[PDB]
């Protein structure tokens, strides 16, 4: 069982017999959400030395993240009011960016590799695009489903397999991230499990047994890239989707 690293264990506990209060209780998932919140709080509270203008070396990091997500959501929705949807496009980044660096620490735990939470967050953003689009643009919201000047005898086919791609968008956006984080962690644990039993046979294998160690180091080098790039790709697709929902093509 190489997948035991994702087990959810209850720690602080709470129960009753009147009402099902077992929904909220401090758990491994919940404790790592508390840790994510305290890290994100720590990146801005004690980072700023006594509210100085000059912005010490720690604040350049949270300066660059801010600027690379402003200049990304200005180039996507880019209309009359792009900044009204900027806090959500930033707080969808920082959760995924911090929750995929915390998960790299060896005896730790991936928030992002729970499909039930990430798929739920994706369905929340998809319904919050459809409701916002219907509210802002009435019955002509469905004009999104015809591409451009197209010949009329093939328009209903191009409507059906446009709407099918419109509600595949509900689960695709989440399952991309879930699949990347889950496959990366499962790859690292399985190769560690193979190189461990590689190094317990006869003593000639601990000699020149440095090359599988170097391969695992190279995969860990790759895994930060595949963890930060997904945190960026989430925040670019849910900027493009707000471009479609707010502005009709």
């Amino acid at each position: 069982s190489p997948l035991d690293q994702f087990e959810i264990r209850t720690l602080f506990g709470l129960q009753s017999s009147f009402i099902d209060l077992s929904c909220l209780n401090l758990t491994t998932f919940s404790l790592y959400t508390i840790i994510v919140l305290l890290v994100i709080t720590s990146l801005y509270t004690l980072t700023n030395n006594n509210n100085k203008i000059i912005g010490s070396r720690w604040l350049i990091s949270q300066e660059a993240i801010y600027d690379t997500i402003m200049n990304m959501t200005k180039g996507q929705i880019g209309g009359k009011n792009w900044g009204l949807y900027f806090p959500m496009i930033f707080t969808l980044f920082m959760f995924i960016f911090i929750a995929n660096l915390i998960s790299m620490i060896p005896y730790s735990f991936a928030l992002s590799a729970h499909l039930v939470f990430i798929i739920s967050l994706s369905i929340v953003i998809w319904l919050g695009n459809t409701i916002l689009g219907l509210y802002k643009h009435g019955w002509v919201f469905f004009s999104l489903f015809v591409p451009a000047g197209t010949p009329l005898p093939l328009v209903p086919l191009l409507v059906i397999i446009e709407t099918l791609s419109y509600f595949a968008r509900a689960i695709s956006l989440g399952l991309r991230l879930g699949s990347n984080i889950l496959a990366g962690h499962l790859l690292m644990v399985i190769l560690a499990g193979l190189t461990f039993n590689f190094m317990l046979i006869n003593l000639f294998t601990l000699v020149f047994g440095f090359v599988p160690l170097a391969m695992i180091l190279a995969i860990m080098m790759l895994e930060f890239a595949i963890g930060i790039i997904q945190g960026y790709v989430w925040a670019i697709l849910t900027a493009s989707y707000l471009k479609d929902a707010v502005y009709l093509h």
Partner: peptide
Amino acid sequence: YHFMGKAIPPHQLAIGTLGLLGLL
């Protein structure tokens, strides 16, 4: 901005196909 049978130019046509496949 289509023109079906020289009638009034239809709105976007997208709702009617969904309504046809809805009742099935």
